[PDB]
Amino acid sequence: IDPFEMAVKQLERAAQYMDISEEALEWLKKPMRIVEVSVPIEMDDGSVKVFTGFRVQHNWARGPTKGGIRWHPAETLSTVKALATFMTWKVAVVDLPYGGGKGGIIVNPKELSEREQERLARAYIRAVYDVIGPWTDIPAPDVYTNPKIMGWMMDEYETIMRRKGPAFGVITGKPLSIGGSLGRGTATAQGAIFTIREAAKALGIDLKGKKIAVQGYGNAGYYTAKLAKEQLGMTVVAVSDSRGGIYNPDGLDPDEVLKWKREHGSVKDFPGATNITNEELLELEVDVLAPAAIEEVITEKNADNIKAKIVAEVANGPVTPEADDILREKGILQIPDFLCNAGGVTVSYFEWVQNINGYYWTEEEVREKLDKKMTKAFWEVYNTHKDKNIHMRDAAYVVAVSRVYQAMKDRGWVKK
Ligand SMILES: N[C@@H](CCC(=O)O)C(=O)O
Secondary structure (H helix, E strand, O other), X not given: OOHHHHHHHHHHHHHHHOOOOHHHHHHHOOOOEEEEEEEEEEOOOXXXXXXXXXXXXXXXXXXXXEEEEEEOOOOOHHHHHHHHHHXXXXXXXXXXXXXXXEEEEOOOOOOOOHHHHHHHHHHHHHHHHHHOEOOXXXXXXXXXXXXXXXXXXXXXXXXXXXXXXXXXXXXXXXXXXXXXXXXXXXXXHHHHHHHHHHHHHHHOOXXXXXXEEEEOOOHHHHHHXXXXXXXXXXXXXXXXXXXXXXXOOOOOOHHHHHHHHHHOOOOOOOOOOEEEXXXXXXXXXXXXXXXOXXXXXXXXOOHHHXXXXXXXXXXXXXXXXXXXXXXXXXXXXXXXXXXXXXXXXHHHHHHHHHHHHOOOOOHHHHHHHHHHHHHHHHHHHHHHHHHHOOOHHHHHHHHHHHHHHHHHHHHOOOOO
16 A cells, blocks of 8 residues: 555554644644656657656754655655655654655666766756755665765766855765765664664673574675674574575575675575575574565564564564564564664764764774664663553654654744
């Protein structure tokens, strides 16, 4: 059903466990500003083709909006609005001076060439310039969008702004050569590792030598497994993909698996492991489950088959609302998605701070700062969950919407 309707219904259901006025809830139920523009480019055949681009600024009570740009052929305004609403909560839960935003272009980047991609990025910036800025709206990379497009977009924005302010801060996730940050590439997996470490500390289970399964061997999933094996002392026994999955009782080395992904199709047919499917990995005996794949994979059909003490939501929406209650009844600690993968937006915030200050940090400073914010965020959510006897998703929503509501009351946007 409609993504924005799902997000609004989730917020309504989470509003039951916290004191919020009706006017503020109605304010939060709709985005503050929605921009739909035409994005024309010159194709390699010389013809001009016009694309539809979106930019949604859900709420800027706590600061400038922040969200990625999507280049997907199945992108709609409703999906962008839903993701912007989720970005608002994501930046509110980790205490960032940001609001929630999102953008997108209905396009297939595979069919476009390199020059067409650069033209598309520059035209999107020229179209949405009036509503974006370093203190207004900071975009970021997302699906089918990379630091190269970030660099093109930053260059176009700087060309339009005539270098009259900090142009590097208009967009994050850009190359290190031009205003990039250290630790951006592994930000979300590092944040997820921090939240998993805190969840284990809060459960009383020692994670060294414990089984972990990660679904989806993408950028987030591979690094989640690699850091789980490296700094958490986990044991990656199973990983999965879009074609299938592999499983090994002794465990797998993330470097080899990623090496294999480069020579053969996906992760299927690992030499020493067993070829399994995605549902099999979901209902597999591991200590921590990390579904970093597409959304809606843990559902009512397989909710009661889950046997993982910790379900880390690296992806956006990997667990359905009824699966949340089923897992809570089963006594499984569930880390909400907009809290678990908040490391990416936190490191993007660090990059923005470095851009606006003109001074840049090292790897260690970024890592320690990210560790502190994710630890504080997880502890706030878990304390809210314990003091009120609610699902962890409800506690995270309470924590985020409380900050947003407080900012709205301070600004005088809403009174009661
Ligand atoms: N949490 C964001 C990261 C991009 C950003 O820095 O806003 C996302 O992946 O949607």
